[PDB]
Each structure stands twice: as structure tokens, then as C-alpha cells.
Amino acid sequence: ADTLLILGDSLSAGYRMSASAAWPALLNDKWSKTSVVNASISGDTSQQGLARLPALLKQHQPRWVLVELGGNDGLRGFQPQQTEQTLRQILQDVKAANAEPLLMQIRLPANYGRRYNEAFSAIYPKLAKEFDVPLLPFFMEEVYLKPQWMQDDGIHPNRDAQPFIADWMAKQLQPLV
């Protein structure tokens, strides 16, 4: 069975819930076929993800790698420039491992910076075009439209939202896998 590696942060690992309750675990159940490995850690910056990548690649030898990182950057100490570079290497390492990189668009809260958001957001379309890889939409956009699927912090999706996200991701990944 082929393997889809998910390299992400709390949006994929789940925030304040077990990984078994997070959408990647639900997606794996929907798929006695494609194997989904959730290598996501709440709080991980794009750099912390890149540091774990080497071992993950040579350990799971995945055909596809879903990169969902960057959202934490801007809280720890990096700029769009650094974030862009970090993600750039991740894509390179994935390609070098004969795996297909799948980049997910990330967006920050309206209250994070006037033009800072535009600079951060632009990073994804640029890299996607630079490496010519699929650029998935930010799944949280649909979740924000449903308050009942959001946690008190208005940032992370709750338990009730995971099934919807798993189905949404299945639909987006279907053509890619």
C-alpha cells in the first residue's frame, strides 16, 4: 500500500484532542488501501517540521508528502523570507526522496499585520509555481464559516469539525493520489 505522509502542525495533529480524533486518523479509516501517516506536532514551526523530515522520509518512504506548515511562524521568530526558504528546502527534500510534494495554502488571522498577511500568503503560490506542485486550498476557510466547528480560541477546529475536514481532504486528495 502506498503512503501519504502528512507533515504539519496542530491543524493536522489536532489541538486539545488526541491524534485519533483528528481528521488524518478519520481519513486513514476511509482509506484498507492508501496509508496515511500523521507526522504532525501541535506548535511546530516550518523549521521544526523540516528537522523531522529526513528521518520521516527514509522511514516511511512515502509517495506523497502533504506539507501544512507556516501558520506558527510569526509567533516564534521568523519572517516570510525565512518561512519561504524553510518550506523551499522541505519541497526539495521531498522531491529528492522521489515523493510528490503537496503544499497547502496557509493564511493568518486578519489581526496579524496589514501587509504582513499578503507577504505571508503569497509565499505558498510562489513556491507552488516554483516547484510546479499542487497547491491545496486552506481548509480552515470552510471551517471558519461554521462557528460550531471552531474552538473557543477562534483559531483551531474542534472535534465536531474533524469528520467534515476528513471528507473535504479526501475530495481534494482524490485526484492527487
What does it look like?
One of its GO terms (biological process) is lipid metabolic process. The protein is α/β, with parallel strands linked by helices. It has one domain (1-177): Rossmann fold (3-Layer(aba) Sandwich). Helices cover 43% and strands 14% of the residues. The chain contains seven helices and five strands, in the order βααβαβαβαβαα. It has a five-stranded parallel sheet with strand order 2-1-3-4-5, sandwiched between helices. α2 (23-30) packs across α7 (162-173) and α3 packs parallel to α4.
The largest β sheet comes out as:
5 strands, parallel
Spatial ordering of strands, largest sheet? 2-1-3-4-5
Oligomer: monomer
Alpha-beta classification: alpha/beta
Secondary structure layout plus pairing:
Layout: E1 3-8, H1 10-13, H2 23-30, E2 35-40, H3 46-60, E3 64-68, H4 80-96, E4 100-104, H5 116-130, E5 135-136, H6 140-144, H7 162-173
Parallel strand pairs: 1-2, 1-3, 3-4, 4-5
PDB class: hydrolase
Keywords: Hydrolase, Protease
Assembly: monomeric
